[PDB]
């Protein structure tokens, strides 16, 4: 029997909304492994759900932070230094595109919608990585979440496909710059899962149904399958792995037709 | 002998500022093949420089527009429609990032600098494709430029590597959306070439030395080699090719060690 | 206008057995552009069909050679040296897997059938490249044919998908080793042609490709218009392979 | 505080010849997690070497089979079924090319050398996978080892690069075909480690990789355990890199 024991480790998970959140799936696994966890949530409307999540984890520190505001980000990381002293793990589970941009055609996307989508969904990784750098200890790491439409055309996913391409490229450049300090940076490419952010997408049930009928495992993945991969990548079992996009999608992405 | 005759065809070429540029090379090959070319230029203080380019091409219509300004783009496309009636080809050779973003580390990129790089180098393709769509005739097409830094880490290419990843994903979604009108969209990934744009990339020069020393052909490519690929891709010879990123780099990107 | 003039160039085209061969389409465009063409054929019982193809091209030189036999390849390339003096272009359009390998599942492929599929469909590019090397002139090139299934799972393509993956890797190593002579090596990944309504429904262009579209890309890659391009796999499939789901 | 318990699970590990090798490293991590391991060995003259490996694993059953011989593979799998009743995991760490094929240029590879390399290094996965299928239980899996030379040109790797491309495509098709049984198939692409089988490439890698060092054999062992474990139940058809980030770089530093 092998064990993963993260007692003594300090983790920050950004982007929790409810118990179906993929960020919450990872936090739950890190907690279960023995890490001390903090969560950040977007806005005050979400605080009561976030309190429910800290309760479900059996205890978590909570912070509010909108990633479009640099001063809210400075406050988050000063708060982390005071509450933790330093940091081992950072999970980035944040994305957004305007509903107007996600129906219809990518070619028809308005300038300010496209810019907002890229700002929240890709630049936010660079912003949080810069601020985490002085805190992050040797052996520490950052993990983000992505999707296959960065590589191949999924109708209706539109500007989000382009933001995910920008995020994956940022993962590689950040792995190069943080590696000399012993810090790793990786991405998880998840298959469809029923979440707040996912079901708002107009394509969702159509692709959810397609995956189950075409993927090698003949089913969709679960949020727990994403949590286990995040746990592994952050843990010392993954100490030779940096700069990587790892797929947890029941093999859907390897299929043609 | 096989001959390709583009007489009667109409091309809009965007982003060209110097005769030593990959964008100029493609416009020059379109002229050689018999097409009429219109050039955009960014600002009225650059009119003299635009006039010299137009002369070096053996004649070209000129239109002012800054691609960050939507009303200006609407005006440019109004003039193109009045001059030509319809359009066959669009060459997108627009790339920019602030000096500060390119000196020092990717992790240290500032928010508005990152967003401007992305707006000018990637969103511009969507802005012009949308306005070109009702003008573009069956058989027509759009071609853009990229480089290996999108897929692999090249020290000091920084946010331009991320903008190019966004641009390549954009090419795939635009191919999907324009294809049913009979219009094709492709990217060219060029090896390092001695252009004026190359002077604004601190990483460029040691990559230049590496390619000559280590690529299969043991030399660098020329701007004429890039111009030939652009002409081929716009021509009827490439009528079955869309959504592609085609490398012209003396084979450098296939090498490992 | 742009002209492509290959007067004085010499081409060897391998693996053509009918006028629908993607190999024949590239041979046709090479001939239209002005090059002299040699076609190989597998055995003397097929001489009749090879003569017919030579006539449909408007004239071509014919050699017998089975790519599993090293001495037949040695004899082919001796004959090419005698008749042409040198070589500019080599078109590799050889593909085969036993019928038993292509019925049923990849996991059930028999050892003998798997090795024969690899030998004919992949090792053959190495064998012909080695023999062409001393003949190939500066600016010369080799081009081969492949398919999507090397990248993504297309059920029922079975061992041929694996053969193509081996073929594309050989392209890259061959580009490295022939590059100091000024010779280039590339592959063309073609969609389906009348040799399906589903491909037409999902392709961005809402149609299948034609064999002329493949012919034109082969000509371009071999021509001096492509002097900077080596080690590359280029897709001519109406955009099909960029799609992440079926329509 | 989270635990991988593989007690009562059964592994077959193929292609291991010494203790300082990547396949041994996976074998040891499966044992550490509670699995029982059966080891194959090529020929009876290597029994003494095999016994010494079984001892270094703290005990393993040993089974003779040359992977080019279908009858010998039939015998092995009959012996595994009688011994274990079934199987959970298969580790394919089999790699070989003739010395002559590895000296000089790829373009100079002789026919029989090329086909032998591909037979032993790639077709062996198909041969053992077909025979494992009826024994493999749901949740079960297959893992194999690869190298970045499949995708990118590494001089002097020669036909082994091409065998690795053949192997990785096989991994994808097998993932699709075994998926309905609930069995998973994946590959690990490892960077260079000081191994016996491996016989300044080591120095160049360390200078260039994001982590500025080479990987260890234990790092490879940990990834194999993960992929075979229930923790990876959503993951099939993948080639996962453990190379200190070396392969993300577009030039040497
Ligand atoms: N659910 C899926 O099918 C799926 C598949 C692949 C990838 N992903 C990715 O997983 C990640 C989490 O998504 P999820 O599916 O768990 O949905 P989710 O809604 O539970 O999580 C998305 C989070 O982003 C946060 N967010 C949005 N804008 C923000 C801003 N300006 N500032 C701070 N936070 C902001 C939201 O508050 C929310 O908590 C996303 O990156 C998503 O793209 C999801
Ligand atoms: N329709 C498709 O699925 C499609 C798509 C992409 C690429 N291709 C490729 O195109 C190439 C040629 O196929 P095609 O569609 O043009 O038709 P084709 O039938 O002419 O190709 C197969 C050829 O292989 C030759 N061949 C087989 N064994 C031989 C031997 N041992 N010695 C010498 N020659 C031998 C045959 O003579 C035959 O002409 C193939 O490599 C194929 O993979 C086909
Ligand atoms: Na800077
Ligand atoms: Na069969
Ligand atoms: Na040799």
mmCIF file of C-alpha atoms in Angstrom, chain B residues 1-6 32-34 172 175-176 179-180 182-184 214 216-219 221 225 228-229 231-232 236-237 239-251 253-255, chain C residues 1-5 7 32-34 172 175-176 179-180 182-184 204-207 209 213 216-217 219-220 224-225 227-239 241-243 247:
data_model
loop_
_atom_site.group_PDB
_atom_site.id
_atom_site.type_symbol
_atom_site.label_atom_id
_atom_site.label_comp_id
_atom_site.label_asym_id
_atom_site.label_seq_id
_atom_site.Cartn_x
_atom_site.Cartn_y
_atom_site.Cartn_z
ATOM 1 C CA UNK B 1 5.101 24.032 -68.084
ATOM 2 C CA UNK B 2 2.352 24.817 -65.642
ATOM 3 C CA UNK B 3 1.260 28.465 -65.340
ATOM 4 C CA UNK B 4 -0.813 30.144 -62.566
ATOM 5 C CA UNK B 5 -2.551 33.301 -63.858
ATOM 6 C CA UNK B 6 -4.214 35.535 -61.252
ATOM 7 C CA UNK B 32 4.172 38.663 -60.182
ATOM 8 C CA UNK B 33 1.255 36.225 -60.668
ATOM 9 C CA UNK B 34 -1.070 38.948 -62.072
ATOM 10 C CA UNK B 172 -9.066 26.770 -37.408
ATOM 11 C CA UNK B 175 -11.793 27.892 -41.692
ATOM 12 C CA UNK B 176 -14.839 26.130 -40.216
ATOM 13 C CA UNK B 179 -15.607 27.133 -45.623
ATOM 14 C CA UNK B 180 -19.307 26.712 -46.614
ATOM 15 C CA UNK B 182 -16.136 28.331 -50.493
ATOM 16 C CA UNK B 183 -13.429 30.424 -48.693
ATOM 17 C CA UNK B 184 -10.174 28.954 -47.190
ATOM 18 C CA UNK B 214 21.483 22.429 -36.896
ATOM 19 C CA UNK B 216 18.456 19.625 -41.992
ATOM 20 C CA UNK B 217 19.401 22.002 -44.879
ATOM 21 C CA UNK B 218 22.115 23.648 -42.653
ATOM 22 C CA UNK B 219 21.065 27.162 -43.633
ATOM 23 C CA UNK B 221 15.292 30.320 -45.225
ATOM 24 C CA UNK B 225 10.702 31.121 -49.825
ATOM 25 C CA UNK B 228 6.212 31.373 -52.700
ATOM 26 C CA UNK B 229 4.287 29.398 -50.025
ATOM 27 C CA UNK B 231 1.101 32.494 -53.313
ATOM 28 C CA UNK B 232 0.617 28.720 -53.523
ATOM 29 C CA UNK B 236 -6.408 27.604 -57.077
ATOM 30 C CA UNK B 237 -3.617 24.972 -56.846
ATOM 31 C CA UNK B 239 -8.025 24.409 -53.474
ATOM 32 C CA UNK B 240 -8.309 21.410 -51.162
ATOM 33 C CA UNK B 241 -6.201 22.911 -48.335
ATOM 34 C CA UNK B 242 -7.803 24.782 -45.385
ATOM 35 C CA UNK B 243 -7.276 25.138 -41.609
ATOM 36 C CA UNK B 244 -3.524 24.288 -41.921
ATOM 37 C CA UNK B 245 -0.276 25.626 -40.347
ATOM 38 C CA UNK B 246 2.495 24.915 -42.929
ATOM 39 C CA UNK B 247 6.175 25.195 -41.850
ATOM 40 C CA UNK B 248 8.888 26.736 -44.009
ATOM 41 C CA UNK B 249 12.059 26.584 -41.829
ATOM 42 C CA UNK B 250 14.675 24.382 -43.504
ATOM 43 C CA UNK B 251 13.266 21.571 -41.329
ATOM 44 C CA UNK B 253 11.236 22.198 -36.052
ATOM 45 C CA UNK B 254 11.568 18.418 -36.626
ATOM 46 C CA UNK B 255 14.937 18.351 -34.784
ATOM 47 C CA UNK C 1 1.757 35.052 -64.244
ATOM 48 C CA UNK C 2 3.670 32.427 -62.293
ATOM 49 C CA UNK C 3 5.162 29.571 -64.309
ATOM 50 C CA UNK C 4 6.562 26.245 -63.004
ATOM 51 C CA UNK C 5 8.954 24.792 -65.626
ATOM 52 C CA UNK C 7 12.056 20.750 -68.366
ATOM 53 C CA UNK C 32 2.293 18.664 -67.531
ATOM 54 C CA UNK C 33 5.056 20.805 -65.911
ATOM 55 C CA UNK C 34 7.657 19.319 -68.335
ATOM 56 C CA UNK C 172 11.806 13.196 -40.526
ATOM 57 C CA UNK C 175 15.144 14.774 -44.155
ATOM 58 C CA UNK C 176 17.900 15.090 -41.584
ATOM 59 C CA UNK C 179 19.550 17.642 -46.166
ATOM 60 C CA UNK C 180 23.345 18.202 -46.448
ATOM 61 C CA UNK C 182 20.353 19.763 -50.700
ATOM 62 C CA UNK C 183 17.597 17.106 -50.970
ATOM 63 C CA UNK C 184 14.166 17.499 -49.266
ATOM 64 C CA UNK C 204 -15.243 22.828 -43.588
ATOM 65 C CA UNK C 205 -15.509 23.022 -47.383
ATOM 66 C CA UNK C 206 -18.648 20.735 -47.274
ATOM 67 C CA UNK C 207 -17.218 18.394 -49.937
ATOM 68 C CA UNK C 209 -11.272 16.518 -52.164
ATOM 69 C CA UNK C 213 -5.945 18.680 -55.536
ATOM 70 C CA UNK C 216 -1.137 19.940 -57.377
ATOM 71 C CA UNK C 217 0.280 19.740 -53.826
ATOM 72 C CA UNK C 219 4.039 19.240 -57.759
ATOM 73 C CA UNK C 220 4.400 22.253 -55.496
ATOM 74 C CA UNK C 224 11.639 24.872 -56.478
ATOM 75 C CA UNK C 225 8.669 26.949 -55.130
ATOM 76 C CA UNK C 227 12.908 25.054 -51.533
ATOM 77 C CA UNK C 228 12.646 25.896 -47.824
ATOM 78 C CA UNK C 229 10.199 23.036 -46.919
ATOM 79 C CA UNK C 230 11.539 19.696 -45.595
ATOM 80 C CA UNK C 231 10.438 17.128 -42.983
ATOM 81 C CA UNK C 232 6.825 18.316 -43.265
ATOM 82 C CA UNK C 233 3.443 16.468 -43.391
ATOM 83 C CA UNK C 234 0.892 18.676 -45.294
ATOM 84 C CA UNK C 235 -2.884 18.007 -45.218
ATOM 85 C CA UNK C 236 -5.106 18.150 -48.324
ATOM 86 C CA UNK C 237 -8.503 17.089 -46.935
ATOM 87 C CA UNK C 238 -10.920 20.053 -47.284
ATOM 88 C CA UNK C 239 -10.186 20.850 -43.612
ATOM 89 C CA UNK C 241 -8.836 16.885 -39.728
ATOM 90 C CA UNK C 242 -9.176 20.215 -37.798
ATOM 91 C CA UNK C 243 -12.689 19.259 -36.578
ATOM 92 C CA UNK C 247 -21.670 17.580 -37.827
#
